[PDB]
Amino acid sequence: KRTNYQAYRSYLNREGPKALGSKEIPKGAENCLEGLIFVITGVLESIERDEAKSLIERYGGKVTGNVSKKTNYLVMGRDSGQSKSDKAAALGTKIIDEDGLLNLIRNLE
Question: In this protein, which residues make up the domain named BRCT?
Answer without folding.
Answer: 28-106
